[PDB]
Amino acid sequence: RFLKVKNWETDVVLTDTLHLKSTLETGCTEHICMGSIMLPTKDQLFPLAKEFLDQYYSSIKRFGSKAHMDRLEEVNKEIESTSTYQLKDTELIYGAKHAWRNASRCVGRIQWSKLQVFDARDCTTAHGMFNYICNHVKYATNKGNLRSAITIFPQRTDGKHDFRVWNSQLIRYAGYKQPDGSTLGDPANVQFTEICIQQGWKAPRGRFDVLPLLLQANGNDPELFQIPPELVLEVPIRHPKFDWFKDLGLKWYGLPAVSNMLLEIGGLEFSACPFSGWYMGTEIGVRDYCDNSRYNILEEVAKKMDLDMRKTSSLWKDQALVEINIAVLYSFQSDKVTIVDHHSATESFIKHMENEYRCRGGCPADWVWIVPPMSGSITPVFHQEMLNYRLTPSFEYQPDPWNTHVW
Amino acid sequence: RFLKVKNWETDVVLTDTLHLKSTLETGCTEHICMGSIMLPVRTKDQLFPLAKEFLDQYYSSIKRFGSKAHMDRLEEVNKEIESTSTYQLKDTELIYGAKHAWRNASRCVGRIQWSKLQVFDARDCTTAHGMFNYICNHVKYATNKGNLRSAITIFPQRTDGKHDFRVWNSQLIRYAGYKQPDGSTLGDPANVQFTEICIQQGWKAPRGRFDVLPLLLQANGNDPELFQIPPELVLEVPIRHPKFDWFKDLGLKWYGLPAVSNMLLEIGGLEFSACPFSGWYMGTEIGVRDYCDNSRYNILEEVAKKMDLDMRKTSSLWKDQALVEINIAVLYSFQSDKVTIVDHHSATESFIKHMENEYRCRGGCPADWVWIVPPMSGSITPVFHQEMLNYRLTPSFEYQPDPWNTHVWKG
Numbered sequence A: 001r002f003l004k005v006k007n008w009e010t011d012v013v014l015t016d017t018l019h020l021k022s023t024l025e026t027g028c029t030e031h032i033c034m035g036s037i038m039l040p041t042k043d044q045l046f047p048l049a050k051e052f053l054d055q056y057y058s059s060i061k062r063f064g065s066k067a068h069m070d071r072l073e074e075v076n077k078e079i080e081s082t083s084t085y086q087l088k089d090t091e092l093i094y095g096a097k098h099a100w101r102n103a104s105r106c107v108g109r110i111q112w113s114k115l116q117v118f119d120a121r122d123c124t125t126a127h128g129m130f131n132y133i134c135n136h137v138k139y140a141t142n143k144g145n146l147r148s149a150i151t152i153f154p155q156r157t158d159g160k161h162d163f164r165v166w167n168s169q170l171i172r173y174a175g176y177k178q179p180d181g182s183t184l185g186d187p188a189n190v191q192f193t194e195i196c197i198q199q200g201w202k203a204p205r206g207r208f209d210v211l212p213l214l215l216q217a218n219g220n221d222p223e224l225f226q227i228p229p230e231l232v233l234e235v236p237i238r239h240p241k242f243d244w245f246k247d248l249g250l251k252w253y254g255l256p257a258v259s260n261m262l263l264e265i266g267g268l269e270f271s272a273c274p275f276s277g278w279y280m281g282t283e284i285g286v287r288d289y290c291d292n293s294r295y296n297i298l299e300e301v302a303k304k305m306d307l308d309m310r311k312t313s314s315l316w317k318d319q320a321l322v323e324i325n326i327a328v329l330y331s332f333q334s335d336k337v338t339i340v341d342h343h344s345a346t347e348s349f350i351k352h353m354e355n356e357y358r359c360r361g362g363c364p365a366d367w368v369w370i371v372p373p374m375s376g377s378i379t380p381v382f383h384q385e386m387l388n389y390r391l392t393p394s395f396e397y398q399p400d401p402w403n404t405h406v407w
Numbered sequence B: 001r002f003l004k005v006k007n008w009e010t011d012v013v014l015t016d017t018l019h020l021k022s023t024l025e026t027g028c029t030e031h032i033c034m035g036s037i038m039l040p041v042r043t044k045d046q047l048f049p050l051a052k053e054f055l056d057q058y059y060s061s062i063k064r065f066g067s068k069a070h071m072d073r074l075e076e077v078n079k080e081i082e083s084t085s086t087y088q089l090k091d092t093e094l095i096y097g098a099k100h101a102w103r104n105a106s107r108c109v110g111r112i113q114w115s116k117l118q119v120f121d122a123r124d125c126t127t128a129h130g131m132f133n134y135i136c137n138h139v140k141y142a143t144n145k146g147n148l149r150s151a152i153t154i155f156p157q158r159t160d161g162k163h164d165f166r167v168w169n170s171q172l173i174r175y176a177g178y179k180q181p182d183g184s185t186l187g188d189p190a191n192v193q194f195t196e197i198c199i200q201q202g203w204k205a206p207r208g209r210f211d212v213l214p215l216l217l218q219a220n221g222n223d224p225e226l227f228q229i230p231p232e233l234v235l236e237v238p239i240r241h242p243k244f245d246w247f248k249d250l251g252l253k254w255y256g257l258p259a260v261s262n263m264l265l266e267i268g269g270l271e272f273s274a275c276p277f278s279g280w281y282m283g284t285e286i287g288v289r290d291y292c293d294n295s296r297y298n299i300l301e302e303v304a305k306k307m308d309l310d311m312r313k314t315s316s317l318w319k320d321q322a323l324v325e326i327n328i329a330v331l332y333s334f335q336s337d338k339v340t341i342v343d344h345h346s347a348t349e350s351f352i353k354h355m356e357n358e359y360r361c362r363g364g365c366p367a368d369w370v371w372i373v374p375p376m377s378g379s380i381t382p383v384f385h386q387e388m389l390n391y392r393l394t395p396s397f398e399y400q401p402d403p404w405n406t407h408v409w410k411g
Ligand code: HEM
Pocket: A100, A103, A105, A106, A107, A108, A109, A111, A115, A148, A149, A150, A275, A276, A277, A278, A279, A280, A283, A340, A345, A369, A395, A397
C-alpha cells in the first residue's frame, strides 16, 4: 500500500503515498506487465466533478469551507439540469497545470506551474480556432525565448460536436511517397499530407514543407489554414566543428506543440487543447533525424565523417548519432532558441521528483519514456526507480479524427 | 485470450498466448506499474503441483506427454515427495530445466543462444573444496582460451534452508574495491562490502585497482571458505583504442568471463541456491556500466580530459562523446585478443530475431524492455521500438538476498 523507490546510484529511497489516489488503470496485471506498450452520462460525472473540486479547494487551503460546499452544490445543480457544467477560470488553470503535473511520460515537469493558459472556450468556428492558434504560436515562440502555453477550446458535449485539431503537432513537416518508392520529407506524415491535398492544399512537394492546420470546430468538417510563415521559427542545422554539416540541408522548427491530446478535468473532456513547451535536443537529433522510419540520416552523416561502416562493432552509428545531436544543440543555442540537453533535463527531473515526493507524496513517472533515447545510463534517471500510475486531471491520447469523423 | 505487441519501426504485430502459462506475480497491478523497480523450505502441499507442472512441460517437449514413461515418472516423484519430502531430478530433466530457466529469463538479451548451454551437474558436491574444484573446471571450460562457451554448474538443491550451498561472490570473477580513509575508492566501488568480508576472512589483499577477488564458498550451510582462482584460469583483456594511443595509459583492463553466481535456479519446485552460470559479454556491460557509471570506475571525466573535449557545458555532449570512444576501445580490445564479445547492435538485432521465432514456435517471449534496451544509443537499436510483454515463467532464475545478511555463523 505504501511503496518505496530507490535510486541505485545515490541510495536515496523515497516513499510513495500519492499512488493511492490513482483512479484509472495501467494496463498491467499481477500476471503481466505492459510497461512498454505505447497504447495499453450525468451519473458518472458528479463523482468526477466532486473529486476534482475537493482537490482544488484543498490546494487553496479552503477545504470544507462554506465557499467549497457552495461550489459543490452549484455544480451538482448544474449537472442535474444541463447534463454538464462549466469550470471557473481559476479551476481551468489549476486543471491544466495539474494535467501537466500528472503527465507521467513528461521529463519537463519541473516547469509545470509556469504554464500560460489561454481560455478559448468562447470559440465557435474554425477561423476562430486558427486565430487562437496563431496567437498561441506567437506567444509561445516569443522570438526564440520560448514560453510554455496551452490553448483550451470548448469541452465535449454529446460528442457529435467535438473540437479537434487534426494535426498531431501544430508545426510538422509534410511527407510524400515518390514514384522512386522512397519518401520525400517526413515519413511520419504521409497519411496526413494526403488528407491535406485531398482537402485542397497546394503542396510545394519539398523536404521541409510546414503542414497547414486542419481545424475542426463544433463537429464540422475540418478546414485548411496556413500558419503565417513569419510565426514559424525554424533553425538551420550546422555543426561547430564540421563545415560540411550545413550542406545536408537540415533544419527543424523551434516550437514543439502537441495538438492531438485530450485534456480531462473534473470529468469534462477538452478534445482540442494544443500545448507547447520547448525541445529536449534528443527529440530532434535522435528521434526525428535518426529513427529508421523518420528522416533516417545516420548513413549519410557517417559517410561524410568517413567512418568504417563495414561492421557494426566500429560503432559508426553511435559516433554519428552523437555528432548529429551536438549539431542540433549548437544550432538552437547559436540562434537563441530555447533548447535543453538530455543531461540538463534529466538532472532537473530528478530534482523535480524529489520536490514532488517531499511536497506531494510522489510523482508518477514512466521510466520507458523518461530515460532519453541515447546515453541512457549516463543520465541520472536511468538509475532512478519510478512508479507509474494515472492521476487526473490528465492528458490522454485519442484516436486520429479521420478514422472517426463522418464527412 | 490473446495479447498483441507492435513494433513501431516495422509495424510487425505479434500475438502472445504464452502469458497464459504464467504463474508468479509481476509486482504490477491494474493501478500501478512497477516495471522499473529492480526487486518488485516448501511444504509437500505446494511441491507436487510444481513438480507435476514441470514434468508435464518436460514430457510434452520430448513428445511423450501421457506416455507410460511420463505417468511412471509422475508416480515415482509423487512417492518420493510423500516418503522423503522432496525429490531428485533426472540428469535429462536438470538439463532441460537449466536451459528453460535461461529461455525464460526476461531480462536477458542473449537468449538466442539458450539451447546451447553446457550443464555441469555438481549435485554430488559436499564441501567447499569440492565447490572450488567444480568452479575452476567451469571457468576453464567456459573460457576455452577466449572462444567463450556458455555454461552452468548446479550444486545440490535446498533441503531445509539450513544447509544451503551458496557462492557468496555475486560473479565468479570480479575486482576488489577498497574504501580509503579520505573517502575515495581504489578499484571497484561495487565490491567494497564483499572485499571487506574477504579481508576479514583472511584474504591478503594486494590493494590495487584490479585485484581479482577470491571465491568465498559455502557448502551444506557451513561457514564459507576462501579460495583463490588460479590466475592462469582468469583471462583478462588490456583495454586500448584503435586510433587513440594514450588510451592504454589509463591502465584499464577487464576480465573476459561474465559469470553470475548469486542467483537461485528454480526447477519443478526445487531450489538450487548455487548455480553459477556464464556466457560472454555485450560490450556496453563493460564500456557503459562497469567503466562509466558514477558509482563504478567512473572514467568519463578522465577520458574526456585526455580527448580535450569542451567540458564546461553538458550541451557539448562531452560525456556522450567520451562514452562512445570507451565502448569502441572495449570492443576493439576484445576482438584483437580474440576473446568473444558482442556489440549492442548485433546483440539486439539477434534478440529481435529470437523473439519473433519464439512468438511463432512458442506463442511468446517474455521480455523486460527496461533491461533489454542497451544503456547507450537506445533508440538506434531495434529493441527500443519493440513493444514487449513481461511475465514470469518457470523454470526460472531469481534474485536472492546476499548471504552475509542471512547466514547463521557456526564459528
Ligand atoms: C517546457 C518544456 C518541456 C519539455 C523539455 C518537455 C519534455 C518532454 C519530452 C522529451 C517528452 C517525450 C517526447 C517524445 O519522446 O515524444 C514529453 C512528453 C510529454 N509531455 Fe512534456 N515537456 C515540456 C513541456 C510540456 C508541457 C507544457 C506539457 C503540457 C502542458 C507537456 C506534457 C507532456 C505530455 C502529455 C507528454 C506525453 C506525450 C505523448 O504521450 O505523446 N510537456 N515531454
